[PDB]
Design an enzyme around this catalytic site. Structure first.
Site, short mmCIF file in Angstrom:
data_model
loop_
_atom_site.label_atom_id
_atom_site.label_comp_id
_atom_site.label_asym_id
_atom_site.label_seq_id
_atom_site.Cartn_x
_atom_site.Cartn_y
_atom_site.Cartn_z
N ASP A 14 0.88 -1.16 0.00
CA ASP A 14 0.00 0.00 0.00
C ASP A 14 0.93 1.22 0.00
OD1 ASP A 14 -2.66 1.38 0.53
OD2 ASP A 14 -1.58 2.00 2.34
N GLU A 70 1.30 0.26 -5.17
CA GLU A 70 0.65 1.43 -5.75
C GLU A 70 0.87 2.69 -4.92
OE1 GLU A 70 -3.54 1.04 -7.26
OE2 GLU A 70 -3.89 2.74 -5.92
#
Ligand SMILES: OC[C@H]1O[C@H](O)[C@H](O)[C@@H](O)[C@@H]1O
Ligand SMILES: [Ca+2]
Ligand SMILES: [Ca+2]
Ligand SMILES: [Ca+2]
Ligand SMILES: [Ca+2]
Length: 920
Positions: A514, A543
């Site tokens: 994350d 991401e």
């Protein structure tokens, strides 16, 4: 030596940085005659009653920052540097409070500030500390507890009984080289609960705190994570039958293997909270995955059989936002009376009248639907209160990084959750045949400081594990919460050691980071190097994209990770197909149509999108279907020859990857609106229900039939809706509902949370009832389309080439340039003699045709090529996305509106001409 004294002239801020053994960076000491580093072991430095600072201090002399320090902290390289004497007792000073003070020649204080010591801590203890192992390390021959606390004055190991009564408190032994504390005992401590009693100075409160904290290296916990527990994860008693022999159902060794990755992002409650066919006691639990007879499990089994290869799990490590004590929780399936007893906010609300009713919370929410509207959002009004005390949350709130979440286990007390979690992993891999990926959140902690219940790391080594503001010392919150500092050596080690346990002890096949860009590129790569030693085929990807840490270190971004083998979610095809961007609100949500919702070809009443803008999205989409490679060559909307890096994506180069395996394409994910809700916001009024289902399929086709790794949200195959909720992390079972009984897609179940979507109520009310809400007919239709797409993806190695150079040698596109038929995506994959060897003995080439438009389109560029419709699509008959497709004698191929056709060139005696990539 002059004495510093007063003429608001006291300690303020914390802009002084003790970065290494002898270097202190601080703006306040510039041009000042007297620059000192005062220190107090057990007291807070402050001028005495006489107005003087009579505490011990060290003399600082002006200097120039060295290369070593400049490289470690580039963002501080401009700070005035000061040197401490080589004989300074660093260890003793770090045991208490240190304050940098500067004064004029006359000795009058000019400024005093607190000191950030993370740098000197690493320079002094990191290497020695890195060479050791942490946590309650239990072997059948004994146990050794170890915790890193280089600044603590005292550390005692407190042992608790099952009933949480103290049975022993052991002062630990500090290692001077590392600053770690340890204690060795017998194996009889197996299963014992424990905490570390800390006596340590916390810069935030400026006091020597005294508190008990759980082990940051905890591998087992008591209910709600109050106590850590001694455990040997190797114990057979904590493993389901045959665990050690569990193998990965899907290969991840070569790039070709990786390219076949087709991810289904799921959540433990989203999967079974509503499934009545799942035994009641397993709903919302890891073990629900073992209910082979349930609608949910049978559904996943069929998805796997059809081509879904990986299950990606939203936070299953120990999150903090769900109370694990069942008596303190109330869910919608339970009596409203229960809700009132555990939630005082509900009992004092406008809904208090329901407290002594005989209705369950969901029955009340159901009745509130009819009169719910933008002017009376009562469903979300009640749900917002329910959310505070239910069992629901995505869980991006780290409490302990290396222990399974307790609320998802049937018994959150102790080791029980370990075997249940493993039983789930085993069921997914062995019985459902899918690999498992875990979402990890090392970019932040749930809390920091010396007081929050969930502050663990920042209590044990204050100001070290968190990233702080250079001037105030305040824990930054760019991630949302309490930003961590992966750039610090011991946290990097904690991360790597944590991943090692999930890999080895829980047999996880991949990790999705994350907000990965908040991590240094070097740290991610180092962790991968370490994990590859345990599992050579482990896959790392992540991401983010909102970076901002580039001033501190080279970040793990899409651009910087090129060629490393670390994957990143691509927002290019995502935005091009969905339309718009995540920041859109109000009318923009409807105006910004995507390729999947008819940009240009089927405009709604509000959009101003031009054909040129629509074609630009098509360029981004085609580039994505080709793996979003930086060097892929294509013909753009204007007929110009462009490399992927030359296609613009809101100011940045579109194509950024070296290999398609470094790119993860998607059109729907847990965050932001679901694909269906976006199509509902964007679809033209005249686009009927059936057309919208096809839009959903066409949108997903760009992902499923593309070279990049395929990723999708659990439920896209069921036209999943969240009733327009954009950020549903705490929206409970109600808005996150997935109905595996196939009655509806959870659309139109009340206006979404007003706090985050209130500004969208106007547009929602206008487009919401355009067409009917999906029912069983539409859900079954979509599931069929979905499984056709995933089956097609694995029907040939040509869809998943893996190597960037191979993609460039075999993949091309037709219907490009200024004379293109808008919305029609035609991709060719060569397997002919000019491509090299035949990778598919059944075909010399494949054609993927996605007609995202309301008109029938005829392809004439394959005339006299003996093209045939895929056997898989033929088999689906009129239920195929290719229903109505015509392959005429002249070789022309006609595609109906909103259709997807995969055509192939049957291979004869020898490899044929195929579909060679044209010279550009
Ligand atoms: O729990 C931490 C965060 O998790 C998710 O990112 C949510 O979207 C966000 O609203 C929340 O603050
Ligand atoms: Ca928890
Ligand atoms: Ca909640
Ligand atoms: Ca910054
Ligand atoms: Ca072939």
């Amino acid at each position: 030596d002059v004495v510093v004294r007063l003429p608001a002239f006291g300690v303020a801020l914390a802009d002084a940085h003790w970065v290494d053994k002898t270097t202190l960076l601080w703006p306040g000491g510039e041009n000042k005659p007297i620059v000192r580093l005062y220190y107090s072991h057990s007291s807070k430095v402050a001028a005495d009653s006489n107005g003087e600072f009579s505490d011990k201090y060290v003399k600082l002399t002006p200097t120039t920052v060295n290369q070593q320090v400049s490289m470690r902290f580039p963002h501080l390289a401009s700070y005035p540097a000061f040197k401490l004497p080589d004989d300074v007792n660093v260890d003793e000073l770090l045991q208490g409070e240190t304050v940098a003070i500067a004064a004029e020649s006359d000795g009058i204080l000019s400024s005093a500030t607190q000191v950030q010591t993370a740098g000197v801590l690493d320079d002094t203890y990191a290497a020695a500390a890195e060479a050791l192992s942490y946590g309650a390390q239990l072997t059948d021959s004994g146990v050794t507890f170890r915790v890193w606390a280089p600044t603590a004055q005292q550390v005692e190991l407190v042992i608790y009984s099952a009933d949480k009564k103290v049975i022993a408190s052991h002062p630990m032994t500090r290692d001077s080289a590392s600053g770690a504390w340890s204690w060795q005992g017998g194996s009889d401590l197996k299963g014992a609960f424990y905490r570390y009693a800390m006596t340590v100075y916390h810069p935030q409160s400026r006091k020597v705190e005294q508190y008990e904290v759980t082990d940051p290296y905890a591998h087992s916990l008591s209910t709600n994570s109050e106590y850590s527990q001694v455990v040997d994860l190797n114990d057979s008693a904590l493993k389901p039958e045959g665990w050690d022999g569990l193998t990965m159902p899907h290969a991840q060794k070569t790039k070709a293997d990786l390219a076949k990755m087709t991810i289904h992002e799921s959540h433990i409650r989203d999967l079974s909270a509503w499934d009545q066919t799942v035994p009641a006691e397993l709903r919302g639990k890891y073990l629900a995955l073992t209910a082979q007879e349930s609608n949910m499990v049978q559904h996943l089994k069929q998805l796997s059989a059809s081509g879904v290869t990986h299950i990606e799990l939203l936070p299953v490590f120990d999150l903090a936002t769900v109370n694990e004590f069942s008596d303190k929780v109330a869910d919608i399936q339970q009596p409203f009376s229960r809700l009132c007893e555990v939630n005082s906010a509900v009992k004092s609300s406008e809904f208090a009248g329901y407290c002594d009713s005989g209705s369950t919370v969901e029955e009340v929410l159901t009745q509130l639907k009819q009169n719910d509207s933008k002017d009376n959002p009562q469903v979300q009004a009640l749900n917002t209160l329910v959310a505070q005390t239910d069992s629901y949350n995505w869980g991006y709130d780290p409490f302990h990084y290396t222990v399974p979440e307790g609320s998802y286990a049937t018994d959150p007390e102790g080791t029980a959750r370990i075997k249940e979690f493993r039983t789930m992993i085993q069921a997914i891999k062995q019985d459902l045949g899918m690999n498992v990926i875990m979402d990890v959140v090392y970019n932040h902690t749930n809390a920091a400081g010396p007081t929050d219940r969930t502050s663990v790391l920042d209590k044990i080594v204050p100001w070290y594990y968190q990233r702080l503001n250079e001037t105030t010392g305040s824990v930054e919150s760019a991630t949302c919460c309490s930003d961590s500092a992966p750039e610090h050596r011991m946290f990097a080690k904690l991360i790597a050691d944590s991943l090692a346990v999930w890999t080895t002890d829980y047999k996880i096949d991949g990790f999705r980071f994350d907000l990965m860009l908040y991590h240094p590129k070097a740290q991610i790569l180092s962790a991968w190097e370490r994990i590859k030693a345990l599992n050579p085929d482990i896959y790392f990807f992540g991401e983010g994209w909102d970076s901002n840490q580039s001033d501190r270190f080279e970040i793990a971004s899409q651009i910087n990770l090129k060629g490393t083998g670390i994957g990143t979610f691509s927002d290019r095809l995502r935005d091009a197909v969905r339309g718009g961007g995540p920041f859109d609100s109000g009318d923009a949500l409807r105006q910004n149509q995507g390729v999947g919702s008819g940009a240009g070809v089927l405009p709604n009443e509000l959009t101003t999108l031009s054909d040129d803008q629509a074609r630009h999205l098509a360029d981004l989409t085609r580039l994505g279907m080709a793996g979003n490679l930086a060097d892929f060559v294509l013909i753009d909307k204007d007929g110009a020859v462009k490399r992927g890096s030359e296609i613009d994506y809101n100011g940045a180069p579109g194509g950024y990857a070296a290999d398609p395996t470094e790119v993860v394409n998607y059109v729907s994910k847990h965050d932001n609106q679901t694909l269906w809700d976006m199509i509902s916001y964007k679809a033209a009024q005249e686009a009927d229900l059936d057309t919208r289902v096809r839009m959903q399929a066409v949108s997903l086709a760009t992902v499923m039939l593309g070279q990049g790794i395929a990723f999708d949200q659990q439920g896209s195959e069921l036209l999943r809706s969240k009733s327009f909720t954009r950020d549903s992390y705490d929206s409970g079972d109600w808005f996150n509902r997935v109905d595996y009984s196939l009655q509806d897609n959870n659309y139109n179940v009340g206006m979404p949370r007003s706090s985050d979507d209130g500004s969208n109520y106007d547009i929602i009310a206008r487009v919401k009832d355009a067409v009917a809400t999906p029912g069983e007919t539409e859900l079954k239709q979509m599931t069929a389309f979905y499984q056709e797409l995933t089956a097609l993806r694995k029907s040939s190695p040509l869809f998943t080439l893996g190597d960037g150079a191979t993609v460039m040698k075999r993949v091309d596109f037709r219907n490009t340039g200024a004379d293109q038929q808008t919305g029609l995506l035609v991709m060719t994959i060569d397997d002919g003699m000019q491509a090299g060897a035949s990778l598919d003995s059944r075909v010399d080439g494949i054609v993927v045709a996605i007609n995202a438009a309301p008109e029938s389109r005829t392809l004439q560029d394959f005339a006299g090529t003996s093209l045939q419709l895929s056997a898989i699509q033929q088999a689906a008959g009129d239920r195929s996305l290719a229903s109505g497709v015509q392959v005429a004698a002249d070789g022309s191929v006609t595609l109906p509106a909103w259709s997807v056709a995969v055509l192939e060139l049957p291979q004869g005696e020898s490899q044929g001409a195929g579909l060679p990539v044209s010279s550009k």
